[PDB]
Amino acid sequence: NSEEDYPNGTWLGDENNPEMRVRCAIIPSDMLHISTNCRTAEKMALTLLDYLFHREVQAVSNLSGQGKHGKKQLDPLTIYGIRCHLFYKFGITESDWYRIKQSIDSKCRTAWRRKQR
DNA sequence: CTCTCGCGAGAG
């Protein structure tokens, strides 16, 4: 939320808009790897996921924190940052963000499916 | 691996 949280990290979203920006952990070198190879909001979303949540946090959680498996909830502020970074770099819509959330939940489901094996 | 379907439980 404030840059003092992560010093060597970067900003998710628009740096010059204090209301639509989140400070996160990934280093400026990884943040250029993402904005270079991820040329669609769908690929950027799931690359940001791998780089913002340790995979065994992915294998134990989902977005809302509900469900029959009783998974934990992924950080609502981190998920907000992904929402700003996709809006800022791609100008996604409310329906576009809904599809993205479905992809994120499906990615975390496969991480859960793996963990059992 | 991602994408996306459809099932079935619970909220409304």
Added chain:
DNA sequence: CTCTCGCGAGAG
């Protein structure tokens, strides 16, 4: 009953 939502899983 309709809708929302988590889910397993197959296909690409």
